[PDB]
Design a protein around this ligand. Sequence first.
Ligand SMILES: *[C@@H]1O[C@H](CO)[C@@H](O[C@@H]2O[C@H](CO)[C@@H](O)[C@H](O)[C@H]2NC(C)=O)[C@H](O)[C@H]1NC(C)=O
Ligand SMILES: *[C@@H]1O[C@H](CO)[C@@H](O[C@@H]2O[C@H](CO)[C@@H](O)[C@H](O)[C@H]2NC(C)=O)[C@H](O)[C@H]1NC(C)=O
Ligand SMILES: *[C@@H]1O[C@H](CO)[C@@H](O[C@@H]2O[C@H](CO)[C@@H](O)[C@H](O)[C@H]2NC(C)=O)[C@H](O)[C@H]1NC(C)=O
Ligand SMILES: *[C@@H]1O[C@H](CO)[C@@H](O[C@@H]2O[C@H](CO)[C@@H](O)[C@H](O)[C@H]2NC(C)=O)[C@H](O)[C@H]1NC(C)=O
Ligand SMILES: *[C@@H]1O[C@H](CO)[C@@H](O[C@@H]2O[C@H](CO)[C@@H](O)[C@H](O)[C@H]2NC(C)=O)[C@H](O)[C@H]1NC(C)=O
Ligand SMILES: *[C@@H]1O[C@H](CO)[C@@H](O)[C@H](O)[C@H]1NC(C)=O
Lengths: 50, 170, 106
Amino acid sequence: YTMSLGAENSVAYSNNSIAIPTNFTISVTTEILPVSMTKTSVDCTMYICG
Amino acid sequence: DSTECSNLLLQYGSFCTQLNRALTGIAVEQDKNTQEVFAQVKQIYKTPPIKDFGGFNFSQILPDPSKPSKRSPIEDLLFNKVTNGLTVLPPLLTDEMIAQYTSALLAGTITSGWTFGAGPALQIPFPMQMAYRFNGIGVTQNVLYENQKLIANQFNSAIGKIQDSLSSTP
Amino acid sequence: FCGKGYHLMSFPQSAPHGVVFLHVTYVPAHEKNFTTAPAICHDGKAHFPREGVFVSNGTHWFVTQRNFYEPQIITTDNTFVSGNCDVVIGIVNNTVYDPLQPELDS
Ligand SMILES: *[C@@H]1O[C@H](CO)[C@@H](O[C@@H]2O[C@H](CO)[C@@H](O)[C@H](O)[C@H]2NC(C)=O)[C@H](O)[C@H]1NC(C)=O
Ligand SMILES: *[C@@H]1O[C@H](CO)[C@@H](O[C@@H]2O[C@H](CO)[C@@H](O)[C@H](O)[C@H]2NC(C)=O)[C@H](O)[C@H]1NC(C)=O
Ligand SMILES: *[C@@H]1O[C@H](CO)[C@@H](O[C@@H]2O[C@H](CO)[C@@H](O)[C@H](O)[C@H]2NC(C)=O)[C@H](O)[C@H]1NC(C)=O
Ligand SMILES: *[C@@H]1O[C@H](CO)[C@@H](O[C@@H]2O[C@H](CO)[C@@H](O)[C@H](O)[C@H]2NC(C)=O)[C@H](O)[C@H]1NC(C)=O
Ligand SMILES: *[C@@H]1O[C@H](CO)[C@@H](O[C@@H]2O[C@H](CO)[C@@H](O)[C@H](O)[C@H]2NC(C)=O)[C@H](O)[C@H]1NC(C)=O
Ligand SMILES: *[C@@H]1O[C@H](CO)[C@@H](O)[C@H](O)[C@H]1NC(C)=O
């Protein structure tokens, strides 16, 4: 299929109307970031020649 | 297509697999880069049919209905001004969908301010959004409201100068 | 940068070769429509909110903070005066209460 980009939302814009929140949600989200790798050392002489 | 060459190439092992895997990683990285840059909204916002923004003109940045590509005049100018086993994979997002994402971002930032980036899109008049931005840089709202026509004229002139500067500089 | 929404705080958690950030953010919810104006015209003077925004529920005008609906009476304590009513486009007529007015009366 042709992928959808998002749900379509039409914002009710007018020159004298505003939308004010009356409530809130405390949202906790996860962010995973890699920091380090495995520290690998290769003996070049032993790898090539043993 | 030389079979003797491939038979000799098999002596070198999995070099070809490493080259293909590195190129595949680059290829998926490009799609990930486009996804991170442009797909920052999951709601496709549209501007109202009446472009009454208190004198502020966004025609050079909003999509042009007359063009079949549905691009803005600035985006159309930008797209016009950029010109053996090898294959070119197409990007996952076409130029039309990237233009649609930019249109959604423009509609959100015009009709809703910065509210759509932090939650639900809350509508606000654009001369009130501009006043909020003026308060963000430490200028009182009255300065924006009293001089709203001049600021709208300066903004429109600057947007036109941007289009002229892009069209006139190689 | 620190999660989706208005960032409040964050918590670090160790992970194998990595870090996990628990971003605690504030998201607005249950939004409601109001009729808004840039300024209030009173006594030939233009009044602008000090920190909030003018909203109307249909008949009465209030001032509220921008990110949460908390309607309060439009007074001189939460508005400031700049100029007359002839310059601001979209200024509406409403009374502005004075807290000092019952004091000198009594
Ligand atoms: C604020 O009011 C507008 C219009 O009075 C509402 O927008 C309409 O919402 C309905 C229901 O989703 C749609 O069927 C209409 O097409 C919308 N009209 C327009 C012009 O956008 C809007 O939902 C109201 N906002 C809130 C928070 O209630
Ligand atoms: C704001 O939203 C919260 C929930 O996000 C509402 O709290 C709920 O209230 C109902 C009825 O009082 C309870 O049955 C629920 O259990 C409550 N939920 C939670 C998580 O406590 C709250 O009432 C809302 N406030 C306003 C003013 O709309
Ligand atoms: C917004 O800006 C556009 C572009 O500057 C205006 O369109 C111009 O309108 C004048 C007269 O109406 C024409 O002579 C130009 O040729 C138009 N330019 C283009 C590129 O179409 C438009 O009038 C402005 N205002 C509104 C409300 O859209
Ligand atoms: C808008 O809000 C105001 C205040 O919250 C409402 O005015 C009050 O309405 C109650 C209910 O009838 C009365 O008992 C009070 O005396 C009113 N206050 C004043 C100062 O008159 C008003 O009704 C609301 N309007 C709408 C359309 O909801
Ligand atoms: C808001 O209030 C002002 C002040 O009372 C009104 O301005 C007056 O309008 C009358 C009738 O048109 C004129 O005779 C006066 O000369 C005006 N005074 C000033 C200082 O301009 C204004 O019309 C009101 N606007 C609304 C929408 O009610
Ligand atoms: C909004 O537009 C209407 C015309 O549809 C006009 O009468 C009104 O004064 C405008 N308000 C502002 C604040 O520009």
